[model samples]
Target: QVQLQQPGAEVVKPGASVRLSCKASGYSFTSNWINWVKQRPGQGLEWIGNISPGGSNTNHNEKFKSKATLTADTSSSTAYMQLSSLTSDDSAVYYCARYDGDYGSFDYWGQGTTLTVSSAKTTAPSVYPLAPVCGDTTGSSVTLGCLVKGYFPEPVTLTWNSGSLSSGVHTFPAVLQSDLYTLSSSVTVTSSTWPSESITCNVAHPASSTKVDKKIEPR
Candidate 1:
C-alpha cells in the first residue's frame, strides 16, 4: 500500500507563507495525480485542487484561489502545496492527497501536518491523534471518535441519521492538543429492533475529502 508522510508541524507569521511537502512511497508517483486539501480551524475540509506529475495540468477549488498554490516534482516522487498570507484563520492541517483515478475520489490519505500562525515564536506541535475506527454493534452503547490529522480545530461530523446533530447530550468532548483536534459521538440502540443500520464519519481537509462507514449487525 502507498503511504503519505507529511511534516509534523509548520509555523508561519502573519502575511508570510509556508510550504508543505508530501513524500510518497510504495507506488509510482507518475501513475497518479497529487491533490491538496484545506481545513480551517474547526471547519470542514475543502478541496484546494490537484496536479499531475506527468504534466502541469492543475485543478483547484475556486474558493481557494487566493490562499493556495499546487505543484509537484515527479523526479523525487513528491508533491507540494504552499499556503500564503498567514492568519489565525489560516492555521489548520494541510494534507497531500492522491486520486483513485483521473477523476475519482480520494481513497487514501496522508497523516497530515498542522500549521500554526502566530506573532510570537512558534512551537512545533506533534501529529494529531489518529481517527478512531469503530464497528457497529446492536443493542449496546457504542462510541465513535473522529480524529482529524493535519488540520487544527478539526472540522468533522458523525451522523447517525440523515440530519444535523444537536450539541451536547450524547456528544463527547472535543480534544485540542499539539495543534490537532478531535470529536466523538455515542448512542444506544437495539440490534434486533432494526434489520440493519449505518453510521458514517465524514472528514474534509485542505488536501482531500473522505468518508468512512460501517454497518451494524446483531451478534
Candidate 2:
C-alpha cells in the first residue's frame, strides 16, 4: 500500500489557475514517475500529464497542450500540476497515481481533489440543456434523458439538479463543428428523488456562467 495524499477541494475563478499537490509515501519517489488524471462528475477519466520526480522529464496528453503543467519536488516526494486558463469545464476531480516505472501502468492511486472553476471572472457562450422528457415509467425507479449542447470558445459544465439526490450525469465528449465546440451531457434521476416542480439544468461557461440554466418541467 502506497499512499498518495491530495488536497481537499478548491474553488477558483475563471480565467485564473490553481496549483494542486500530491504527496507520495511508502515507496522510492525517484524510481517511478507520477501520473495525473482528471474526472468530471458523471463522466469518464482523462489522462492529464505525468512527471518524473527524479528530473525535469514530463509528458502531457496532446489534448492538454497548453492547459496543464506538471512538476515535482524530489526532496519532499511530492508532485504538482497547475491548470491554467481556467473555465467551467476544468471543474473536475484530479488524482495522482504512482506510475509503475519498472513494470507498466500506475499501481497506486490518490483519493482525488475536487476543483471548481467559478464563473464570476469570465464571459461565455450560450448553453442550452434540452429539457428531459420522461420516458418508460415502468418500475419503482425512473430515468430521464437530457442533452446539454452549445457553441463555445471554451468548455461548458452541464448538471442536472432536483435538490433531492446526486443524480448522475453522462457527459459526452466534445465535438468540433467548424468554429463551434458542442458539449453534450445526459442525466438520469431515480424515482427515489422527489422531483421538483421545475428541475434546472445549470450550465457554467465563461461567457454565460450559470445564467443559462434551463428549466425542465417535472410533469
Q: Candidate 1, residues 117-138: lDDT per residue as tens digits?
A: 7554312212222222444454
What C-alpha lDDT values do all the predictions have? 0.63, 0.73
| lDDT for predicted candidate 2 compared with the true structure | 0.73
Candidate 2 residue runs with Cα over 4 Å from true position? 119-219
User: What is the lDDT for 55 in model 1?
Assistant: 86
Clashing pairs in 2: 123-206, 123-207, 124-206, 124-207, 124-208
- After superposing all C-alphas onto the true structure, candidate 1 shows an RMSD in angstroms of 13.3
lDDT of 1 at 36: 84
Q: What is candidate 2's lDDT per residue for 1-219, written digit by digit as tens?
A: 589999877768779989999999898888888899999988999999898888769998999979999999989988999999998789899999988856688888999998877543333555554543555445665445445444544567656663342446667776545435667665566555525344566666655544466665555
